[PDB]
Amino acid sequence: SMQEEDTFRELRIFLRNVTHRLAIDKRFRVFTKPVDPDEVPDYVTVIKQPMDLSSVISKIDLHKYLTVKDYLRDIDLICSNALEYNPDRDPGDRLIRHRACALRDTAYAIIKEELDEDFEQLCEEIQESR
Numbered sequence: 001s002m003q004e005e006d007t008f009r010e011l012r013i014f015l016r017n018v019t020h021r022l023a024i025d026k027r028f029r030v031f032t033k034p035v036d037p038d039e040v041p042d043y044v045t046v047i048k049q050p051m052d053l054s055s056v057i058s059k060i061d062l063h064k065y066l067t068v069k070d071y072l073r074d075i076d077l078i079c080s081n082a083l084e085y086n087p088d089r090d091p092g093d094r095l096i097r098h099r100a101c102a103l104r105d106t107a108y109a110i111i112k113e114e115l116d117e118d119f120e121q122l123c124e125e126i127q128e129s130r
């Protein structure tokens with residue numbers, strides 16, 4: 001229905017706004033673009049599902065997220081990919097992990113404050129009905 005189309009359009013507007021706020025935070029610059037293979041050739045071999053905030057924007061626009069839970073799975077993937085690829089004790093790796101954990105915690109904290117639980121529940125029920 002048009003009511004259901006209006007629900008998913010509101011979801012995409014909400015998700016673009018959250019993603020924009022993460023993408024403009026200087027701490028998260030490293031997560032804004034896919035890994036350049038000419039800089040990091042072994043990335044695509046080690047990380048089986050690359051994810052970055054530009055890819056999340058592309059996926060919103062392709063109507064790939066029908067719930068905030070599905071969006072948060074891709075934020076969680078950005079974080080787990082960073083922890084997996086940069087596991088060492090050296091400060092370079094520790095800084096990336098701290099930023100990855102901050103990106104995840106920030107996304108979760110925005111959604112906790114700004115997502116209506118009944119809006120998420122409606123999305124989940126339209127999703128389950130398809």
Ligand SMILES: Cc1ccc(NC(=O)CN2C(=O)NC(C)(C)C2=O)cc1S(=O)(=O)N1CCCCCC1
Nearest residue numbers: 030031033034035036039051052078081082085096
């Ligand atoms: C999880 C994750 C998502 C996206 C990126 N993207 C980049 O690193 C992009 N990029 C380049 O390819 N070159 C420069 C350094 C110019 C740049 O900004 C990276 C990650 S990551 O955290 O897994 N990670 C970044 C730390 C260093 C190793 C590469 C992968």
